[PDB]
C-alpha cells in the first residue's frame, strides 16, 4: 500500500536526527557563530536589509531581515526581523498582512523601505513598510501600496534593477517574464500594468535576475532546461539575445557574479551548479557537484569574488571556492568531494527554502527551512583563512 512511504520517511527522519545530533556536537569547531531560531510559521524567503546600526559602546550590532510566512491555513504576513550580531537574539519588528504565503520578497536597492512580494496568485504586490503599522490589523486585510498585473499564474523569480530605479522583473509558472516600471508612479493608481512581457521560455520560468552593471541585460532560467540572456534594448521579446542548453533538468536559479561582469552561475534539478561566461555561453566553464538533490537557490558572496553558495532539497547548504578548482587531493579527501567544495552546512533538517549572505558581516549567512527553522551562522575563520 501507501504505508511503505510513510514508514520509509520515518526511517529517513531517524537518520536525519542522528546526523543532526552529530553536527550539533561538531559546531564549536566548524562555526564562529551559529544561532538557531524557530519561526512561528516557515519562511519561504529570506534577504538581509542593507542597513546596519552599531550602538556606541556596545558589543553587538543590529541587522535586519525580510522574511515572510507560510501558514497551513491562517493569516499570512510579510516580516521584518532584527538580529543582534556579535561585534569586532532575534525579534520580529514589523508584520504586514499578506494575501497568501510570501513566495519571495525583495527590497528595492534604491529605496530599501520598498519591498516586492510574489504570491500564490498572479498578482505581484508591492509594499512600503513605512506606510504601514508595525502591528498588523486583526482583520488580516492585505492592503498593498501597489498591485502589478501581467501574469496568469504565480511564480518565484523577482528582481529589482540596481541601475534603473523601479524596474522590476518577475518570473511565473505561466512561462512568461514581466517587467514593470513603478517609477511611473501615479498619484494613486494603486494598480499597474506590465511594460513588457518576455515569452522565450516554453515552460515554468523559475527565476530571473538583472545584471548588476549593465542596465539593459537580464537572465532567466526555466523548466525547459534553458538559460536565456535578455537585452531590454532589442525589440524582439519572444526571442532572447542568447539561449543556452544549461542543464539536463529543470533550472531553478541563477546569480550574477558581483565582481566579474561576464560570470554567472545557475543551479538545477540535475543536482549541479553550472558556471557560465557570457562571452561564450556555448561552453560551460565548470560544473560544481556534490549536492544530493535538486538545487533551488544560488548566491555569490558579496565580499569574496571566488565564493559561491547553493542550497536545495537535500537539506544542505554548500559553499564553493572557485580558486580551488583543479587542485589535487589525497584519495581520502576526494571521497568527501571536489577540491572547490569548501563547506557543507549541515545545520538544517528539512529542505532549505532560501538563504541570504549578510552584506555587512563577511561570511555570515542566514538560511531558512521548511520546518520553521531560521539559522544565522558563520563558518570558522581557519576554514577559509589560509
Amino acid at each position: 500500500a501507501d504505508k511503505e512511504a510513510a514508514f520509509d520517511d520515518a526511517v529517513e527522519e531517524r537518520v536525519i536526527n542522528e546526523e543532526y545530533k552529530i553536527w550539533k556536537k561538531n559546531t564549536p569547531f566548524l562555526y564562529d557563530l551559529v544561532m538557531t531560531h524557530a519561526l512561528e510559521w516557515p519562511s519561504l524567503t529570506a534577504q538581509w536589509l542593507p542597513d546596519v546600526t552599531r550602538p556606541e559602546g556596545k558589543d553587538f550590532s543590529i541587522h535586519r531581515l525580510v522574511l515572510g510566512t507560510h501558514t497551513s491555513d491562517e493569516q499570512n504576513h510579510l516580516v521584518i526581523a532584527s538580529v543582534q550580531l556579535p561585534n569586532d537574539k532575534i525579534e520580529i519588528e514589523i508584520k504586514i498582512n499578506h494575501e497568501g504565503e510570501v513566495n519571495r520578497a525583495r527590497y528595492m536597492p534604491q529605496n530599501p523601505c520598498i519591498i516586492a512580494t510574489k504570491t500564490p496568485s498572479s498578482d505581484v504586490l508591492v509594499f512600503d513598510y513605512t506606510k504601514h503599522p508595525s502591528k498588523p490589523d486583526p482583520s488580516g486585510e492585505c492592503n498593498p501600496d501597489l498591485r502589478l498585473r501581467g501574469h496568469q499564474k504565480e511564480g518565484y523569480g523577482l528582481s529589482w534593477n540596481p541601475n534603473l530605479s523601479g524596474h522590476l522583473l518577475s518570473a511565473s509558472d505561466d512561462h512568461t517574464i514581466c517587467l514593470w516600471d513603478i517609477s511611473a508612479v501615479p498619484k494613486e493608481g494603486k494598480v499597474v500594468d506590465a511594460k513588457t512581457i518576455f515569452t522565450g521560455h516554453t515552460a515554468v520560468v523559475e527565476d530571473v535576475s538583472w545584471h548588476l552593471l549593465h542596465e539593459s541585460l537580464f537572465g532567466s532560467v526555466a523548466d525547459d532546461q534553458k538559460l536565456m540572456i535578455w537585452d531590454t534594448r532589442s525589440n524582439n521579446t519572444s526571442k532572447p539575445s542568447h539561449s543556452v542548453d544549461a542543464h539536463t533538468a529543470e533550472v531553478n536559479c541563477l546569480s550574477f557574479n558581483p565582481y566579474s561582469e561576464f560570470i554567472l552561475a545557475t543551479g538545477s534539478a540535475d543536482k549541479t551548479v553550472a558556471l557560465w561566461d557570457l562571452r561564450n555561453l556555448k561552453l560551460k566553464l565548470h560544473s560544481f557537484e556534490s549536492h544530493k538533490d535538486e538545487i533551488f537557490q544560488v548566491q555569490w558572496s558579496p565580499h569574496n569574488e571566488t565564493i559561491l553558495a547553493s542550497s536545495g532539497t537535500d537539506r544542505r547548504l554548500n559553499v564553493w571556492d572557485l580558486s580551488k578548482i583543479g587542485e589535487e587531493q589525497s584519495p581520502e579527501d576526494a571521497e568527501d568531494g571536489p577540491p572547490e567544495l569548501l563547506f557543507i552546512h549541515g545545520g538544517h533538517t528539512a529542505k532549505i527554502s532560501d538563504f541570504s549572505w549578510n552584506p555587512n558581516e563577511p561570511w555570515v549567512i542566514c538560511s531558512v527551512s521548511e520546518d520553521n527553522i531560521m539559522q544565522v551562522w558563520q563558518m570558522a575563520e581557519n576554514i577559509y583563512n589560509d
Binding site: 569547531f29 568527501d336 568531494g337 569548501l342 563547506f343 552546512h345 549541515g346 563558518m379 570558522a380
Partner: peptide, 22 residues
C-alpha cells in the same frame, strides 16, 4: 593543535561525521 586547521578543513566537508579529537 588538538585540532589542526587541516583536520578542520576536512571536517568542513564531512559535517555528519564526529570530529576526531586525538
Amino acid at each position: 593543535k588538538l585540532l589542526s586547521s587541516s583536520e578542520t578543513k576536512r571536517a568542513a566537508r564531512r559535517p555528519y561525521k564526529p570530529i576526531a579529537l586525538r
